[PDB]
Subunit: 466 residues, 3 copies
Amino acid sequence: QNITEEFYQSTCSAVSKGYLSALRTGWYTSVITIELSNIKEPKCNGTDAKVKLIKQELDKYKNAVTELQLLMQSGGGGSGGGGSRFPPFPLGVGSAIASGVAVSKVLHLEGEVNKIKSALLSTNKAVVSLSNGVSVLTSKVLDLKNYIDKQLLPIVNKQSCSIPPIETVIEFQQKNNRLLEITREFSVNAGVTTPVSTYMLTNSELLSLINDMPITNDQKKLMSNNVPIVRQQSYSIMSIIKEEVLAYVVQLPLYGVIDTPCWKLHTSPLCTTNTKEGSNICLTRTDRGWYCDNAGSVSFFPQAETCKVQSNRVFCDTMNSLTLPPEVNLCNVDIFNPKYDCKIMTSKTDVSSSVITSLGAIVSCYGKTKCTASNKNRGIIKTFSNGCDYVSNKGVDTVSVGNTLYYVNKQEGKSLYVKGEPIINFYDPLVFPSDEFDASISQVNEKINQSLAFIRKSDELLSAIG
Amino acid sequence: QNITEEFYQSTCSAVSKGYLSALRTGWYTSVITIELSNIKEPKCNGTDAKVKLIKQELDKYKNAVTELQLLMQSLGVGSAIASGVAVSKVLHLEGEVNKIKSALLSTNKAVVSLSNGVSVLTSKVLDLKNYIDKQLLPIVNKQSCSIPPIETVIEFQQKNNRLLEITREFSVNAGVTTPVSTYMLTNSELLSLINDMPITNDQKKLMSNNVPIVRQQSYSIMSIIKEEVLAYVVQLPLYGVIDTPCWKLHTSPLCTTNTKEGSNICLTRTDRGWYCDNAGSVSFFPQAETCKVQSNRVFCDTMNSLTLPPEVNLCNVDIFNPKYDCKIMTSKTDVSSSVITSLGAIVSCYGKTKCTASNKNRGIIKTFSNGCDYVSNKGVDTVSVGNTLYYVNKQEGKSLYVKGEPIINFYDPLVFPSDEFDASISQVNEKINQSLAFIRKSDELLSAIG
Amino acid sequence: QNITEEFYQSTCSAVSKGYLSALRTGWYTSVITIELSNIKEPKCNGTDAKVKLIKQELDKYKNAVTELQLLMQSGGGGSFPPFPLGVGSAIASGVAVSKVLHLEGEVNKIKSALLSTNKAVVSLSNGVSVLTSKVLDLKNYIDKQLLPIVNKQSCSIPPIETVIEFQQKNNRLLEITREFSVNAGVTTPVSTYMLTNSELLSLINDMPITNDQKKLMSNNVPIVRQQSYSIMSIIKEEVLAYVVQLPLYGVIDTPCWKLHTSPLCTTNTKEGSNICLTRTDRGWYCDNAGSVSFFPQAETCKVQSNRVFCDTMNSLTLPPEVNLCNVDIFNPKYDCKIMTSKTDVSSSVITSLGAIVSCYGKTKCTASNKNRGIIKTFSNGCDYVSNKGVDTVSVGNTLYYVNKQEGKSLYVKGEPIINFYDPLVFPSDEFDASISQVNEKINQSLAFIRKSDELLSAIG
């Protein structure tokens, strides 16, 4: 690839370029089914150890079915059970599984299970048009019902217990295990699971489902090569168990935006060094996070949690995002530019830290803190002094600030240092607004203008009073 | 249940009513036990395949016992497991292990009163002592290793598995696991425990019907391995508040819409989250991540709650009431966003952003103007703001739009305190009045210089 | 373990002393390997039930190998609080080792290291020298015990013991693959499948630490597992290799103390006409190489007995004089960090051996003993109760349980400093301020009132 990075000395920030987008823009819902045996508790006067084992396994099957019935009588969510942390203040709140739960609700209607049974009578992969009009893919991943009714029931519902061969015991355990594990995952998660396990959907099943999705060939390639990330961004929703059938909705991500350029903004505090003790003013860019070009705008992801990087491919999730004009990138070229009100925040908090970037490290070293960049073999190679500086991952293994040792990413590429005057040095510290939790260049310049003009006016008055 | 929803246009915020409470006020603790074999590494001379398998499984068991021994001893702020830890510290005191042990010699369910006066159900859930001693100790740990049946191999793996899985769960969770897994306590065991608890039949019905949520809000606490017994404490919620009115507050930014650049002021209700009536007060859950909803039933932990006067609800009906000072934030951040409510969607559309509500068949069914607006989930499937597509909840209910003047209009922007990250109506009013007072001091002074 | 506690009425805060540090100062990485058989699909034309079971298990093995192959192509890793806290890269070390392992010829380096032995130090290319372990040899069992049975154009019938034993051996590979597949190749905590308990203990023995540190890690294996990563690296050349990244506790046994804070508001009669002040420096503090390591997110720190396992990457380095904020809040050497508001609601903080209660407004705030009932009804303000005869603390509809840990606590009487502040000069919405910054704003507002009022007074 060409992963590049730029450090701006003027603003104590860095931008990593060269990444390729994979944005989650929508959802694809599918229905997965397991055929279950009707079957009852064994009427079988039996005493052999193999009979005991088969009966124990049939009890595990029966209890799993019971526990899934309990799960179905509260099936999906109440827009779930529960949700993630309230999005940060600017962002919005969504209902992640509203789509899959909408499908799960339809499955609860009477006669729906019968529609699905009669489309999978002959085959394992069929489309069904539900009552509400939506057509869904429907899979049968496991046929217990056949195995128990043909191999097991003939030996347990006589009254006198045909002794099984040990191979039948082992085989029945093998088949029953997936139902058991699906039920465990559902019971401990209130019927909604993420990520989607290999029990909920195997690799072969997921790849077949991906190949049947209404997406492009490039989208199918991207999803197939990145099954782990897809599982990370998927939900399995318990829906129903009736008519000798278990049905759950699997909700796969839909990567509507692909291959658009992304970049990542890292920010560290930029304080004055020239003064001593509590006389220093600090500003810090606040727009850190991921950016991807998206439909003539920029999709901004401020939480480092909603984006997942493999190599140069950035799988972000549009639900946790803002939409901004392209001019936002001017904050990385001309932070005082007129077209965009670049957002900063201020304080007097004069303490040191370091941010590990994609292929480098930003160090904000203030006061008398030990700030150092070192190599496992050759020793210290860069000794920082007061201010905000940067060191590339080339030839550097660790960055040490205070008593904290950071390892840098040996993910390798080319970084460029853009020398420039720190902008904190352009502000008069007497008229500096040093408690802005969120501000902009225009808002801060506005407050400065106001304070200056008041000093102006009151002095004019105090001179005119002789 | 009749879930209802209201959208206050005046304050850009919605309220979902009709839910019913289940608030955890107490803890019930139970002592789960597994009887074990004092066994040692065996002195058999083996070399057979089935013998090798049984030795492997026995060493799995012995390593699990060793792991559990190395475990057993090695808003506000609270600790959720204080009750269970109290019981666990009781069990470490010598003599109590024998108390439970004799209490379960004959039966598998018992009530035991321990030394510091707590009455706890204790339950033997697995007896590896007797299986190992009667089926698996004879053929092993003598001169040379009589052969086992393959049925014995199968059965010993099947039995040792629960101990092994419990040991793993405790191994990665440092001896405290939540939710309580099915290996710690199966569905049958949990239901029996519930039916034997000293609680109302209302609580028995609620807990029995909502086992997964009970697991969500429970704890398995590793306690002891002594006297050939493994004991852990399971800690279950006691929902001392049931069927009281709960309601959910959703909020979104409310901004001026005209006309140019960054010349707008913004204001947002901050009190969003779950509310439930509780002993003549309102329990507020601000981390609405902590409440779990099944149908119309909201399960919350009161330890994650704040307590408010009932007058807090006035903020929904009249944000300028005298009695309660409604908490808001102010800002200038004029960005488009959307909140997916219980059965609708709030959309705050500002600037060039295109905002839409679409049905899966009719295409777009609403195009939002700049400002704060609402849409019901009747005939709406998705809400699209900018590049973000949200699906709306499809739980059904009735949704009422309460027309009103956006209160951000009532504010003169030239004296608007647009920094207030935590404020209220009256704090903003006080700052507005103070700025006006400074203005008027200067103004009447200069009028007087004539 | 002498846990002591002091409550400071003047500042509505409390310090619990008497703890011992265990700080994650660094990382230790090693490479774990499993030997795998190549094996193609068997194609033996037999249909005995045991043959069926063997071929099913081989299919599970084959799909596991394919899932690991996919995870290799993606790679293990291809890569917050505002108090300026740094932004690290947790698995950068292990990912560096994995990156090296991807290169041509490194697999054969480890393979040649591990023919004669099961544990050996390998020198890979980029100046990395890693301890390598071989923890399962599936290639030998498959190629000796299984392959003759099943690759013969007419498969010999296996004994049932072979079916069961193959399931036993294949289990660990299957479980490791399952863990990796739902975590995108990076799992934490490190499970007993990734690294069993005896394996982890041996790896601990072969770390470059003092025997005291080895004892500490081996006695708190659950904490070590919680603080460790397993990074899938490669499957190729009949070898599966994944990197294990263990915490490295370079600082242990130094003094640690925890600071708890609670809002300190004015009790007076009227309204939200109160001023409120709160120390913002809650969290853990540990002496560290002549400085104080500060952990503001007390979330990041585990506590076992009086030992505090913290991670330095969630910490700030502070001068020792920070502790002076616990003695004189107004001392000039260190500038104590506070916050202010008018926000009037009651809360309670459970300390190590007590409870701070900030009871404001018309709230029922009580402290109860389980056998005696309510033993204190808190009056409006900030107060403290010790666990000596106190079991629970109830504020509003919320019931907190007090820590019953044995120790001694000292109530330190003093005048609440919120009373020193004039409620009209008071800067009452400061999200993150200091004593000095509040004094600065108060002086500025006072000066404005002085000038404005005297000015308009002299206009006779």
